[model samples]
Target chain A: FELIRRFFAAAACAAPAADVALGIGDDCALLAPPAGEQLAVSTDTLVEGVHFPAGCDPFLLAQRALAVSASDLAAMGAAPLAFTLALTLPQADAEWLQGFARGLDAMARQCGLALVGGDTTRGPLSMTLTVFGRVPAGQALTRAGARPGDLLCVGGPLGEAGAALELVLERRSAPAEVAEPLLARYWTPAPQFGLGLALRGKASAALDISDGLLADCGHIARASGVALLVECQRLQASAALSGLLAGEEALRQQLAAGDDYVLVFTLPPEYLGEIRAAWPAMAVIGRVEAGQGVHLLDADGKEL
Target chain B: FELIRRFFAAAACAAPAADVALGIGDDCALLAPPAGEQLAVSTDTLVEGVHFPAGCDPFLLAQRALAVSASDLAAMGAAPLAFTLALTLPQADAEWLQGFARGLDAMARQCGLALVGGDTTRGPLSMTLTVFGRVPAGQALTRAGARPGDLLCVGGPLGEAGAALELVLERRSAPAEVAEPLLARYWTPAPQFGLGLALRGKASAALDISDGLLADCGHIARASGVALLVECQRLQASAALSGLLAGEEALRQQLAAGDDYVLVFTLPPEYLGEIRAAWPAMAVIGRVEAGQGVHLLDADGKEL
Candidate 1:
């Protein structure tokens, strides 16, 4: 119990928490979201060997785990508030806990969310974090709200996280040119919370790019009953993403690779001026159209 | 991903979710706590071997997991709203998922909380659930609010959940007359949400009895900066608890044994009239004192 208390105390000490009425050490943490704001809650789990390799750095693992879960708040266009962590450890190693605490605290500080509550138990190493955020009443961005003929945009470059996973899992020698950026994107990818806030009233439908753009856009299509046509010519990645693979293969990997943690959203074409001005890195790579399912188009406008 | 979606679809089909703006299909489940209400959130984890027997019934495990977590809402005097489950399975066992969903749905119905959102992944079997509830602003029961001379009461009987565990782990049979109730108490705890709400302005400090009365009371004592003096003569358990062991041993088990999920709370003596009028079954087993730490006193007024 003290091991857990120490870990939480470590994770929470420097993380901001002015909003929590009560945090760790309570049976239930009390959160007071201001009047008229709805609470947004999301839970995500990371299991060893499946989510990350067994030899993965504990520091990176902790940072990535918290980021992925909090990214759901980004998807909802909500302000980050607090989070509760449920961590299962095979053994209570002091060194491991210290490193994990450091990683978690750093990420919490980056996200501006407090460590509110948690439970720690002994078992196979795994983590489940539930993040809470706030959005004004009836104003949450949702996938079901997309309309036909809207401009589909992504918050940032894609395929980096997926590429990093491949490079690590395949035991290929890290290409010094882009290895750090790729791995950093994989391990500490920023949730597009800022972009979501910017897209709040403008974007009709939005979701964090978790399982790549193409697959996740399919979710928006299915939910909103609209077709998504992603144009290959407009499809772009960071130079590192482009250099890593061949042309057609790179496109597929960018469209299909998972864990980019960017935002894929749809808005009226007119909103592009403001959105692009605000986040110039964001790209309009696709469009919502009348129909169902998602389609990929070649530069010549033929379906590929 | 479809496997998870279908599982969530099934879990939501049979559960209540009218309060959720978006649940299961979106990145975050959106919840609007009523005006002037604060949300109470808690997370609890159940690891297969450490938290439960490896081969425990999946159905029972599901109910127990949700109940134990929801008990925190009760401890906070919050009304049940919804819960999210993060489940890790070793295999895509259809039958296991079905039973687990059934048990989870059933418990959600009993608690009147929706199956809001969750993530399912493949790994060693484990579960982490986050439960959310609401309490009026500034009225939540907390561990830090107890005053000297407050009475300590428990919502119901003790030692049952712990006794049931002993029966299973030790390979010992429960006495025939009370076997079912004891086992049911362990697997299907009735979280005292109603009692908690009633104690909102009445109880000074409160917590669910997960880690035993003595241990849990220590939390209240530490947080409230008060001592707890328990009277041995007033420490009576249900007939089943009494029948399970001898005097000193039964008392020890009731005080030290964990996982009961009953509410142990403190309130000013003046409120006892309204409390007992409402819950005659609640036991006044101890009192808050001016000093620090806990003390046990015998019928002869000697420290036990």
Candidate 2:
């Protein structure tokens, strides 16, 4: 227990969070949500070998685990505040614990989130994290909020994480330059907090790109009772992605790949220019239509 | 994912929770805490073989997991709000999933808590649950509140879970009647949420006895900067415990064993009668004194 405490203390909460009455080292953590504000909570689990590659670096694994969870907060347009981690390991190697802690701390610092409380026990290696964030009441973004005539946008590029996995697991061939960029995206996914927050009251609906962009867009489509028309040629990283892989495969990865952690949201078409001006990098990739389900199209408007 | 949904929908949340704005099927569950109340969060993970026996009854395993986490809320004198479950399963057996969901729903309904959201993945069988509860601002119980002359009390008997484990694992000899009651306690622990709430304004410091009573008392002692003098003969479970095992052995099990999920708390000696009058069954077995550490004593005031 002392060993576990020592390992976590390195990445323990730095300063008192806004409404977190208590952080770590207690039976329960306490949070005081602001008046009229709603708290958003998300839980994610990453297991060894199944969720991550076998013999992967602990540092990278830790970052991926944390950032992926934080992406949920971004998806909700909620500000990250605190999180609890329940880590189960097969053994208690000090070096591995240290690397994991360091990696967790780096992401926590990067996301402006704090470690609240958790426990570490010996078992099959896995981490279950519950994150908490606050958003104005009735103003949080969700998939059910999309509507027809809304423009769909992405916070950043896609296909990199799925690309990174092939090289890391040595399951496929890829160029060094391509693998390097994908690895960076895979290891430390920047949760689109800024983009998500800026989208408050602007984006009609939103979700993070996980389990593939097409799959997540389907979630919005089903939830909002609308159809989405995504134009594949408008994607910024397509050319770069195509260079790394053949035409059809690159497009498949772009459409169906997972672990992007980037915000995919819909906003009123009239307000699209305002959002683009405020957040210059957001890509307008699709538009919500009056129907159900998502459809992918090419530059010539042919369904692909 | 659809299979997991079918399993949950069978026992899915029936009605909206009081402060839960959004439950399952969202990127994040939204919570609206009552005015001037703080949210108490606790997380627990149970791994197959380590936390429970391999191939344990799925129903019992589910109850045990949920109850243990709910016990944390009881320790904090908080009312249950909602919980999220992340379950990692080796395989998605229909029967197992149904029984698990049934057990979970039974406990959630019993505790007046709702299942907000969760993630299910394929892996070694494990469940990590994060629980949320509500306590009035500055009213939640913690370990740092005890004072000298505070009386130590317990909500229920101890050693039953430890005894049950011995029987379940076939590690010890026990009679049928003895094993059955112990098994019931082990499988479906009654998280003393009512007792915790009743003690909110009365108790100085409190926590659930997941660890042995003596070890947990040591925590209160160390945290409150006081000493606890526990009178062994005053414990009511001795008669029942002695029936299962020999005297000193039973005593050791009561002192050293874990998984009881009973509340061990401290109350000012002055308010003891008021609490005792309201909750007649609570056992007063110890008292806080000046100094530090927990000391066990015989009925004659001699240190054991």
TM-score of each: 0.93, 0.94
Q: Candidate 1's residue-wise lDDT over A208-263, tens digit each?
A: 98767888999899999999999999977688776566576667668888798989
Q: What lDDT tens digits, residue by residue, belong to model 1 across residues B43-93?
A: 999988777888777888889999999999999999998888898989887
TM-score of 2: 0.94
Evaluate residue B270 in candidate 2 and report its C-alpha lDDT on the 0 to 100 scale.
Answer: 84
With candidate 2 superimposed using the best TM-score fit, by how many Å does residue B299's alpha carbon deviate from the native? Answer: 5.0
lDDT, model 2, position A101: 88
List chain B TM-scores, each candidate: 0.95, 0.95
lDDT by residue (tens digit), candidate 2, B1-304: 7765587744655347688898777789998888788889999999998778997889888889999999999999999999999999998898998888988988888888888888888898899999999999778889988899889888877787887788878898777776777788788889998888898888999999987999999889987899998888876564446668777767777787888898899998888888778777688888999999989999789997
lDDT of each: 0.85, 0.85
**Winning model by DockQ:** 1
Cα interface RMSD of each candidate: 1.0, 0.9
- Tens-digit lDDT string for candidate 2 (A1-304): 7765687744655357788887765689998877878999999999888778867888888889989998999999999988999999898888888888889888899998888888677798999999989899878998898989999888877787777777677888767776777787788889988888889998999999989999989989998999999998876564446556766666677788888898899999887887788778788898999998889998899897
Clash number for each model: 0, 0
Candidate 2, position B222, lDDT: 82
Off by over 4 Å in 2: A9-14, A172-178, A236-243, A298-300, B9-14, B172-176, B238-243, B298-304
